Paper text:
Multidrug resistance-associated protein 2 (MRP2/ABCC2) is a polyspecific efflux transporter of organic anions expressed in hepatocyte canalicular membranes. MRP2 (multidrug resistance-associated protein, 2) is a primary active transporter of the ATP-binding cassette (ABC) class. We have built an atomic model for rMrp2 that consists of a small N-terminal transmembrane domain (TMD0) that is linked to two transmembrane domains (TMD), TMD1 and TMD2, by the lasso linker (L0). Each TMD consists of 6 TM helices, enclosing the pocket for substrates and drugs binding, and they are linked to two nucleotide binding domains (NBDs), NBD1 and NBD2, where ATP binding and hydrolysis provides the free energy required for the transport cycle completion.
In the absence of nucleotides, rMrp2 adopts an inward-facing conformation with the TMDs open to the cytosol where substrates and drugs can access it. An unusual feature of the rMrp2 cryo-EM maps was the presence of helical-like density within the TMD1 and TMD2 interface that corresponds to the regulatory domain (R-domain); MRP2 and other members of the ABCC family contain an R-domain that regulates their transport activity upon phosphorylation by specific kinases (CKII, PKC, PKA and PLK kinases). Although, continuous density from NBD1 to the helical density can be observed, only the helical part, residues Ala895-Lys924, was modelled as the rest of the density is weak and without defined side chains; in addition, there is no density that links the C-terminus of the R-domain to the elbow helix. Although the R-domain is observed deep inside the TMD of the rMRP2 structure, our functional data show that rMrp2 retains its ATPase activity adding further support for the concept of the R-domain equilibrium.
Author numbering: 1 to 265, 298 to 861, 895 to 924, 958 to 1530
């Protein structure tokens, strides 16, 4: 067959030459039969599989014509080649038989290509794997022919200019076709591009390349992320799952039933069916992921072998040059292909995890709607929504880590094999270190978790103290108490800081072990290797290929414990879920919803029970209600009327009889149920909107006054924001919803409980009365009132679960049997915050085991960074940076030394075999490893102490400044916001931020060390890191910008699923009664899909990132390999080893660095907010220059001078120049219009509001010229609303401990708390809960006045809140104030006139100005505004 080209084809010796080109005939035979063979062996299948497809869908577009035209051009070239071959046949006497076989072949093939590119018009995926891969393969195989011909043409050998030139042009067209087939075509109608993108643009996730730009320009919104395709929609996956489940569930139910009946002749449930059902429904994706993972696990072990070949080549100086370029190119190609396989495996695996979580949440919801009440009472609503919110997450985590449990053992076994095959049985020393460091990592992780839990408890205590400080800041300002509470929260914070330091030290040990495992394993392996034998030499190939294999081995061997832990947690999660879904549905045998019947409601001989073991709550019942027949059942409390209602709907288990119901029911429960949303949405309750009926039912049910009181009217949002409607509004809203629903039977069940009498009668008359809106509808009332009965249609009295009698009210008042007796007698008739946070703690402490591999599974202005770094210190971060740079320099030195230890095998100069030399080598290698370890410990421990100092200082400043901010700041800012800055931002600064910054430093220095090694070998590489740096910088910028918003959107969308599930499982009787299950199913599926698209877009963002980063690391490896092949005449094999076994470890560090840059951007906003509250404006100085004469109020003489005060510097004066005077000892009341300036007086004597004009002078000293605390301590107050600080009676009465126990007891006896306080066990140290739960209201203000009396100043400003307190309390207050504060100036602010005439003086204050002065005796003679207001 050699004659086919008149020249030899399989020579194999032309390669054995410096400039070694392939033989032409070999090329034109096999490098042409490979692509054409691929095209022909599969094309009939592609055509046979496409021409049985959907509509022609032959939209004639621009790529389709471009590709057809280029293939036509190229067919024309093939025909021209045939013509020239025949023309040469007319010339020479002999022609190779292939000179026409090759062109003819192309002719046929291109027709086929023209018939495949047209075929694509029928499919949705235009450019598929087949034709795209054929173009790749053809362009790849033709480069050999290209290079041969061009090299021969520069020789000007005159062989054939025409053949060579037509080949050049045909190859150009094949390049343009490959490019034009990579491009995803002109996308059709607005589908997600995941299913219209070409093969290459879908392998590299380059169809996501426009979401990333779009998210970088302006932030993404829920309408900027494309919908997930229809195969993942909740309805689709749940339908598939239920088809695959029903059979397994039934089989397990049969097994459980047979087991129970065998036992009998709750700890058993139909079990071991969920995991089989999930595999039987997702097995195709399981296989796809399995095969992709297998291919990647086999491809991982080619790069060490190519590295071995390249070291060997650079060593042997008599080798060819075409070998080594081939090895560098193969390193690039293998890393590219394994990147594609791995990223596609992640996409499959993570989307399968998402689909498993989706189908499980949807199954949970579908089951909660039909769970038997007997099985529904076992759980709690918090625990059920927990079953949705943690169990499905655990099952998703197991689904992600499911393929690692065998992939990691394949990788471990192959790595042990390939390490053995190089370094003999002394590999087990290194692998033994690697394995033996697993229990140590576990021990450190356990101690970390214990410290974290104790810290969490201590943090919650501090947070509760802070919350009671902030919510009662007014009193704390009054009595000058911020130093005491400052010290208390400082003590708790000091405890938390010590725990944080211990956490830090263990984290440091964990980091040191993580970063020193590789150097220690290599020193142990090489020492044990070179020692155990004399003829056991260590050369560059063994040393550096074994180092590469150790870096491959150490990742699976460390992730294996966490994978097994995740599987074992998901096992118990599966048991919990599988127990929920197996519980039998509620039975509807007893209650039948027929369509036609004689009576609307018919109870036939029925008894019903909550729990069959006990006696029936409702006994035998025989009754019938015809349409329109209003019935008002009445009975003793606990008789079962509420139970009768509950049984009618179906919320009871039948013990006997049955019930017939026709039409649609409407339920008004005793327990009110209001969904999250607006009053209008609740009233409509998912029904058609009609303004006539809507306004009629608002008017009838008397909501209009409530809407007028409420801010938004019928648009106010209930729940999740907080309106907490009083029982009247809730009950009216429920009744309005029922009335608007327009049902057939209305089961009114005590709908006038929390309602006033007259409004209740109005509601009865215009809602359920005979003239009400519900005249024609059967309406069963459940009454605790009587006055409605004289006009109700019919009465059924109930007792002991049985009807005593039924009749009209006339019969009730006439028959005088049980009728009159009943008529006479009836007159006298949180859970998630501590658990949902636990799963976040677990998945953040388990995915924080990055180990430079944070691709395992994942979950701003420079001034802010400068603020944090200024807090942590500047010398500290200088020495942290320096002592990690020393670590990296020692690592570079260690590699350089190993390169000079493997080198003494080549230069076997006699002296490189003595035992002293080997001892020196292994000793200095160990010393370099030890120096690296010491530098790392110093750096990390210093980092921990410095970052602890930063956290301490930041919290100190924030708390010292918040406690000293004028009351306007606390009025204009929600307490929730400040507490949230003290809770989740001090925590971020404490825990997450230091480790994120430290890890960023470690990644940066690892990269810099690798790059300086590469550039130390071949310095030209310092120029190929200016474009690589630009590519990497652009990648991280785009990825972090987009991923931040995707994570935010996912978090925003996740919560509504659980909120809606909790609202469904809470108000289930109402949903079932209105017959609204399908609407709620649809809503839950909609919310799940809206979340699903965000989480899927996040997954794809991660894959986009990973492809780009593996490309950057691949280009580093490939460029260094090329520069070490090119420059081989000046370097050695050892340099190749240590340059190229490190560049292989540059993609993991790049992934880690991008992830940590994103994390630092996310976390530093905590410092942003903390620094925002550090700078909040402060009050006046507490102590400025002056002191009192040991007692500033001598007798309480207060003088005003046209005082003018403003609430906020941009507003109008509330006081407009008051000029009055109070002498020593008089009692002054102040009066006026509502909002005329009452509050400002008691708010301005304490300087809480600074003067805008005028001044107040006490005892000849102006208020504005003394320190704020100095003045504020010397007065006295009884605040408007008594706030009690949780703790001890001693602290509440006296936190400063300045008052002795004897006088505290004397003041408490003056306040007369001996009966209540002395009777307590501890006495004056009795615990005080958060205000209430003890110390009755009267005790509360009596304690407040005790505080006032032990303060015992000469000035008593006070005001009254409400008269709800017992009159004895007010009388005691006034008597005490008059008996022990008689000789003290008193100012009272009262809006109740009846307690003011007793005052020695009254000030009249309207519109912020005085009206009259003098005593009430001096007033009442006149008839001024005081008279116009008093006694009326």
């Amino acid at each position: 067959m050699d004659k086919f080209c008149n020249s030899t084809f399989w020579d194999l010796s032309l390669l054995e030459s410096p400039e070694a080109d392939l033989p032409l005939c070999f090329e034109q035979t096999v490098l042409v039969w490979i692509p054409l063979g691929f095209l022909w062996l599969l094309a009939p299948w592609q055509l046979y599989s496409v021409y049985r497809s959907r509509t022609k869908r032959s939209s004639i577009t621009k790529f389709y014509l471009a590709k057809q035209v280029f293939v036509v051009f190229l067919l024309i070239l093939a025909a021209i080649d045939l013509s020239l071959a025949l023309t040469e046949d007319t010339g020479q006497a002999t022609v190779p038989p292939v000179r026409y076989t090759n062109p003819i072949l192309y002719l046929c093939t291109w027709l086929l290509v023209l018939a495949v590119q047209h075929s694509r018009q029928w499919c949705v995926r235009k450019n598929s794997w087949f034709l795209s891969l054929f173009w790749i393969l053809s362009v790849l195989c033709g480069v050999f022919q290209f290079q041969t011909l061009i090299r021969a043409l520069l020789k000007d050998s005159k062989s054939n200019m025409a053949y060579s030139y037509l080949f050049f042009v045909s190859y150009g067209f094949q390049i343009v076709l490959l490019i034009l087939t990579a491009f995803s075509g002109p996308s059709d109608s607005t589908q997600t591009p995941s299913v219209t993108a070409s093969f290459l643009s879908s392998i590299t996730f380059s169809w996501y390349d426009r979401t990333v730009l779009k998210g970088y320009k302006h932030p993404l919104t829920l309408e900027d992320v494309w919908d997930i395709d229809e195969g993942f929609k909740t309805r689709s996956v749940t339908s598939k799952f239920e088809a695959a489940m029903t059979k397994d569930l039934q089989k397990a139910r049969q097994a459980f039933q047979r087991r129970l009946q065998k036992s009998q002749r709750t700890k058993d449930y139909p079990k071991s069916w969920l995991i089989k059902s999930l595999f039987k429904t997702f097995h195709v994706v399981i296989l796809k992921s399995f095969i992709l993972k297998l291919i990647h696990d086999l491809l991982v072990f080619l790069n060490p072998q190519l590295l071995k070949l390249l070291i060997g080549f650079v060593k042997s100086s008599n080798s060819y040059v075409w070998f080594g370029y081939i090895c560098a190119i193969l390193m690039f190609a293998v890393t590219l292909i394994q990147s594609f396989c791995l990223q596609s495996y992640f996409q499959h695996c993570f989307v399968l995890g998402m689909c498993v979580r989706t189908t499980v949440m949807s199954s949970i919801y579908k089951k909660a709607l039909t769970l038997s009440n007997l099985a529904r009472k076992q759980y709690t609503i918090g625990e059920t929504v927990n079953l949705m919110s943690v169990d499905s997450q655990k099952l998703m985590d197991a689904t992600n880590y499911m393929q690692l449990v065998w992939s990691s053992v394949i990788q471990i076994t192959l790595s042990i094999f390939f390490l053995w095959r190089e370094l003999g049985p002394s590999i087990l020393a290194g692998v033994g270190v690697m394995v033996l460091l697993i229990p140590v990592n576990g021990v450190l992780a356990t101690k970390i978790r214990n410290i974290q839990v104790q810290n969490m408890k201590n943090k919650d205590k501090r947070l509760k103290i802070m919350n009671e400080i902030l919510s009662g800041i007014k009193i704390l300002k009054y009595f000058a108490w911020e130093p005491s509470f400052q010290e208390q929260v400082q003590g708790i914070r000091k405890k938390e800081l010590k725990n944080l330091l211990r956490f830090g030290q263990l984290q440091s040990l964990l980091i040191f072990i993580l970063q020193i495992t590789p150097i220690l394993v290599s020193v142990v392996t090489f020492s044990v290797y070179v020692l155990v034998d004399s003829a056991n030499v260590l050369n560059a190939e063994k040393a550096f290929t074994s180092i590469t294999l150790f870096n491959i081995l150490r990742f699976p061997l460390s992730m294996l414990p966490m994978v097994t832990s995740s599987i074992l947690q998901a096992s118990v999660s599966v048991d919990r879920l599988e127990r929920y879904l197996g519980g039998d549905d509620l039975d509807t045998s007893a209650i039948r919803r027929v369509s036609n019947f004689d009576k609307a409601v018919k109870f036939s001989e029925a008894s019903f029970t909550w729990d069959p073991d006990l006696e029936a709550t409702i006994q035998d019942v025989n009754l019938d209600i015809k349409p329109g027949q209003l019935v008002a059942v009445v009975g003793t409390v606990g008789s079962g009327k509420s139970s009768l209602v509950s049984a009618m709907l179906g919320e009871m288990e039948n013990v006997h009889g049955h019930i017939t119901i026709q039409g649609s029911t409407a339920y008004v429960p005793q327990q009110s149920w209001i969904q999250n949303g607006t009053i209008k949405d609740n009233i409509l309750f998912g029904s058609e909107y009609n303004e006539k009926k809507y306004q009629q039912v608002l008017k009838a049910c008397a909501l209009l006054p409530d809407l007028e009181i409420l801010p938004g009217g019928d648009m106010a949002e209930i729940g999740e924001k907080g309106i907490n409607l009083s029982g009247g509004q809730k009950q009216r809203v429920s009744l309005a919803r029922a009335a608007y629903q327009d049902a057939d039977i209305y089961i009114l069940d005590d709908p006038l409980s929390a309602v006033d009498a007259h409004v209740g009668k109005h509601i009865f008359n215009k809602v359920v009365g005979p003239n009400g809106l519900l005249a024609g509808k059967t309406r069963i009332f459940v009454t605790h009132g009587i006055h409605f009965l004289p006009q109700v249609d019919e009465i059924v009295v109930l007792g002991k679960g049985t009807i005593l009698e039924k009749g009209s009210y006339r019969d009730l008042l006439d028959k005088k049997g049980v009728f009159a007796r009943n008529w006479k007698t009836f007159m006298k008739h949180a859970s998630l915050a501590m658990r949902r946070e636990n799963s976040l703690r677990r998945t953040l402490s388990r995915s924080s085991r990055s180990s430079s591999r944070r691709g395992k599974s994942l979950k701003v202005k420079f001034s802010i960074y400068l603020k944090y770094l200024q807090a942590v210190g500047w010398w500290s971060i200088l020495f942290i940076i320096l002592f990690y740079g020393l670590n990296n320099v020692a690592f570079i030195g260690s590699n350089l030394w190993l390169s000079a230890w493997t080198s003494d095998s080549d230069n076997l100069n006699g002296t490189n075999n003595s035992s002293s030399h080997r001892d020196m080598r292994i000793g200095v290698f160990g010393a370099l490893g030890l120096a690296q370890g010491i530098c790392l410990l110093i750096s990390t421990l210093w980092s921990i102490y410095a970052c602890r100092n930063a956290s301490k200082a930041l919290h100190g400043q924030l708390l010292t400044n918040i406690l000293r901010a004028p009351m306007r700041f606390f009025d204009t800012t929600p307490t929730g916001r400040i507490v949230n800055r003290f809770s989740g931002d001090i925590s971020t600064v404490d825990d997450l931020l230091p480790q994120t910054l430290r890890s960023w430093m470690m990644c940066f220095f690892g990269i810099a060390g690798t790059l300086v090694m590469i550039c130390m070998a071949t310095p030209v590489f310092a120029i190929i890191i200016i474009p690589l740096s630009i590519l990497y910088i652009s990648v991280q910028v785009f990825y972090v910008a987009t991923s931040r918003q995707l994570r935010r959107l996912d978090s925003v969308t996740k919560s509504p699923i659980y909120s809606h599930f909790s609202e469904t499982v809470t108000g289930l009787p109402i949903i079932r009664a209105f017959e609204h299950q399908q609407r709620f199913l649809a809503w839950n599926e909609k919310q799940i899909d809206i979340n699903q698209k965000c989480v899927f877009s996040w997954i794809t963002s991660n894959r986009w990132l990973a492809i780009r980063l593996e490309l950057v690391g691949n280009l580093v490896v490939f460029c260094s390999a090329l520069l070490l092949v090119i420059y081989r005449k000046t370097l050695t094999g050892d340099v190749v080893g240590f340059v190229l076994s490190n560049a292989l470890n540059i993609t993991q560090t790049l992934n880690w660095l991008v992830r940590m840059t994103s994390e630092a951007e996310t976390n530093i906003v905590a410092v942003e907010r903390i620094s925002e509250y550090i700078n909040v404006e402060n009050e006046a100085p507490w102590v400025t220059d002056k002191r009192p004469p040991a007692d500033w109020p001598r007798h309480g003489e207060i003088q005003f001078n046209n005082y003018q005060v403003r609430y906020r510097p941009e507003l109008d004066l509330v006081l407009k120049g008051i000029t009055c005077n109070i002498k020593s000892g008089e009692k002054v009341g102040v009066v006026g219009r509502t909002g005329a300036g009452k509050s400002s007086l008691t708010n301005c004597l304490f300087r809480i509001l600074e003067s805008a004009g005028g001044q107040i002078i006490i005892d000849g000293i102006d208020v504005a010229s003394i320190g704020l605390h100095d003045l504020r301590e010397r007065l006295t107050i009884i605040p408007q609303d008594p706030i009690l600080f949780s703790g001890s009676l001693r602290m509440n009465l006296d936190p400063f401990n300045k008052y002795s126990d004897e006088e505290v007891w004397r003041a408490l006896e003056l306040a007369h708390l001996r009966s209540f306080v002395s009777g307590l066990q501890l006495g004056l140290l009795s615990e005080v809960t958060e205000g209430g739960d003890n110390l009755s209201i009267g005790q509360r203000q009596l304690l407040c006045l005790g505080r006032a009396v032990l303060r015992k100043s000469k000035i008593l400003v006070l005001d009254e809140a409400t008269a709800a307190v017992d009159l004895e309390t007010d009388s005691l207050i006034q008597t005490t104030i008059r008996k022990e504060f008689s000789q003290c100036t008193v100012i009272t602010i009262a809006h109740r006139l009846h307690t003011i005439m007793d005052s020695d003086k009254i000030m009249v204050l309207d519109n912020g100005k005085i009206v009259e002065y003098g005593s009430p005796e001096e007033l009442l003679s006149n008839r001024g505004s005081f008279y116009l207001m008093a006694k009326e």
